Amino acid sequence: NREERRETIMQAAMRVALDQGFTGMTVRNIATAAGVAAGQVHHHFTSSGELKSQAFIRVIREMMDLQRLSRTAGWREQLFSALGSEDGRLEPYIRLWRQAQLLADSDPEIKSAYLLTMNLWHDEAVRIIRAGHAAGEFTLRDSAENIAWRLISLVCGLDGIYVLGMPEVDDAAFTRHLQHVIQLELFS
Amino acid sequence: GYLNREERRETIMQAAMRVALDQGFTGMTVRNIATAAGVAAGQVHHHFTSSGELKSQAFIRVIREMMDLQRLSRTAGWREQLFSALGSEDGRLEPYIRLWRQAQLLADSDPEIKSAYLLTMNLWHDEAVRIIRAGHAAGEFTLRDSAENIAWRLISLVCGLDGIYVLGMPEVDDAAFTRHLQHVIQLELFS
DNA sequence: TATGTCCAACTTTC
DNA sequence: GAAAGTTGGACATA
DNA sequence: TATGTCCAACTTTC
DNA sequence: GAAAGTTGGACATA
């Protein structure tokens, strides 16, 4: 069945999302990027809110794909990558991710989508912690689920300060802080 | 009656503070603050460059007042003091916290508020550093890192958890928040 | 206010 | 019945 | 609307 | 009488 038209529109939304952010994700812009009439967008999606939400989730999934293709030499390093990869190709995705966090306060649809990405992120960290524990590399004094929420909280809070302009919390300090908490949570 | 410049400014600032806590930034209009202070609307710009300056400075004062409340909590130890400065469950602080959250978001579109929010983070950090240094000197805290690094990580944990908590995450409620904060304090200062 | 922007429903055309 | 075209007002903002 | 900005007249203090 | 402080509104603007 020719579901390619829906995927064509979706991929247009993904590209507009990464290039212009949520502000640029109008029916007209997406339709132009997809090369279709504006009527077809509603013909394949209930509303623009659904499209923006689904397209945002697709972008976050692509981000996680990009993070996973980086192979590391240990579960410690794979956890750091999953929580704070330095790969520059993730920057456009992280930018959209931050915008969704802000819009979540006023948009319930984006809030729902944003909440899902947190769970997808949490699940990823949980899988890595459980594997490293079974490998004998990680020592667990607490549940993987609890450890993962604290590490994600550490990253989000530290990133909230980083974006402000703190010279004391730059990319270098971010790395050292993340490595330090991994040491405390999983190597004690 | 008539007041000197410093006194008049404080009356306007005090009104701006109570409006912020009662109605948030949205309620902090020139006329609403001036009426709350009992002064002519023009008095605001006689004593502040702009409403943006007034909002930012008043916001800072509110956060300061919050930090005063927490600091006078009469704790029984440096651990309890640090927990209070990071995650006090005192219900009196909630109106201050809601304004704090509001400023974090507005900082994305308002440089004045962003600069003011930046200051509150430093003020918060300064207090955490002092408590950590005090507990270390008192023999209560064990430090494997500088108090400055420890403080930023504890503050980041709090800010990060609060963001998740605000989302409605059932696995991260008020009880979990406390447990997580108490647990990281153990890792950082008692390991 | 009122002005720019945007969209889900409606209308016409084929 | 489907695509193309039009509407009216919602929404945020000058 | 309603909200920010600014000022010429007015009132109090010196 | 001058200086300081205050007022209400005009005007433009988010």
Author numbering:
A (entry chain B): 5 to 192
B (entry chain A): 2 to 192
Task: Reproduce passages from the article.
We previously identified EilR as a regulatory component of a multidrug efflux system from Enterobacter lignolyticus, a bacterium isolated from the soil of a Puerto Rican rainforest because of its ability to catabolize lignin components. In its native context, EilR regulates expression of EilA, an inner membrane transporter that confers tolerance to imidazolium-based ionic liquids, reagents that enhance the microbial conversion of lignocellulosic biomass to chemicals. EilR belongs to the TetR family of transcription factors, which commonly regulate divergently transcribed adjacent genes. Amino acid residues 1–192 of each monomer form 9 α-helices arranged in two domains: the N-terminal DNA-binding domain consists of residues 1–52, forming three α-helices, and the C-terminal ligand-binding domain comprises residues 53–192, forming six α-helices.
Using X-ray crystallographic analysis, we determined the structure of the repressor in complex with the consensus operator DNA, and found that EilR binds as a homodimer. While EilR establishes non-specific DNA contacts through hydrogen bonding with the DNA sugar-phosphate backbone and a salt bridge with a phosphate group, three residues are responsible for the specific binding of EilR to its DNA operator: Residues Arg32 and His47 in the HTH domain establish direct contacts with two nucleotide bases in the eilO major groove. Unlike other characterized members of the TetR family, EilR also specifically interacts with a base located in the minor groove, established by residue Tyr3. Out of the inexhaustible resource for genetic parts found in microbes, we made use of the multidrug efflux regulator EilR from a rainforest bacterium as the key component of this system. This repressor not only recognizes the major groove of its operator DNA like other members of the TetR-family, but it also establishes additional interactions with a base in the minor groove that result in increased DNA affinity and specificity. In particular, we observed that eilOc binds with high affinity to EilR, exceeding that of the native E. lignolyticus operators. Comparison of EilR in its induced and DNA-bound forms showed a significant conformational change around the ligand-binding sites. A small difference in the positions of the DNA-binding domains of the EilR dimer was observed between the induced and DNA-bound states.
